[PDB]
Amino acid sequence: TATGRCNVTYIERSYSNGKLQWTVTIHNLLGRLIAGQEVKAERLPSFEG
Amino acid sequence: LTSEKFEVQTIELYSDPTDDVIFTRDGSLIVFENDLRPQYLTIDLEPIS
């Protein structure tokens, strides 16, 4: 997001409403997270979170 | 259409090789174990006179 970028060691994803819920696993945080944040993958352009 | 109306995350994908023998490559690492997932291996037999 705006607040920063950090790397995820792996994700699990579990079910709410039938859309999966990815629950990732990260090292650290740059900047204060927010519920809504504008998300993009550092490594990938294609994905959106 | 998107994922909510879909249920399961991990789907065994079924395929029939043109090949008798299977080739591991990179992170392509075959495994057999049973107790955890039995549903792949099935042994059957006919006793004979």
Swiss-Prot record, chain A:
Protein name as it appears in the record: Baseplate wedge protein gp7
Coiled-coil positions: none
Function text: Intermediate/inner baseplate protein. The gp25-(gp6)2-gp7 module is involved in sheath contraction. Involved in the tail assembly.
Subcellular locations according to the entry: Virion
Organism: Enterobacteria phage T4
Complete-protein stretch covered: 788 to 836 of 1032
Family: Belongs to the T4likevirus baseplate wedge protein gp7 family.
Gene name of the encoded protein: 7
Subunit structure, as described in the record: Heterotrimer with gp6; assembles as a (gp6)2-gp7 heterotrimeric molecule. The (gp6)2-gp7 heterotrimeric molecule further interacts with gp25 and gp53. The gp25-(gp6)2-gp7 module is involved in sheath contraction. Interacts with gp8. Binds to gp10 homotrimer; disulfide-linked. Heteromultimer with gp10; a gp10 molecule is disulfide-linked to gp7 and the other two remaining gp10 molecules form a disulfide bond.
Swiss-Prot record, chain B:
Top-rank lineage group of the source organism: Viruses
Compartmental location: Virion
Record-given protein name: Baseplate wedge protein gp6
Segment of the intact protein contained: 611 to 659 of 660
Coiled-coil residues: none
Entry's induction text: Expressed in the late phase of the viral replicative cycle.
Entry similarity comment: Belongs to the T4likevirus baseplate wedge protein gp6 family.
Subunit and partners: Homodimer; each gp6 molecule in the ring interacts with its two neighbors, forming an N-terminal dimer with one and a C-terminal dimer with the other. Heterotrimer with gp7; gp6 is part of a (gp6)2-gp7 heterotrimeric molecule. The (gp6)2-gp7 heterotrimeric molecule further interacts with gp25 and gp53; the gp25-(gp6)2-gp7 module is involved in sheath contraction.
Its biological purpose: Baseplate protein that is located next to the tail tube (inner baseplate). Involved in the tail assembly. The gp25-(gp6)2-gp7 module is involved in sheath contraction.
Organism the protein comes from: Enterobacteria phage T4 (Bacteriophage T4)
Gene name linked to the record: 6
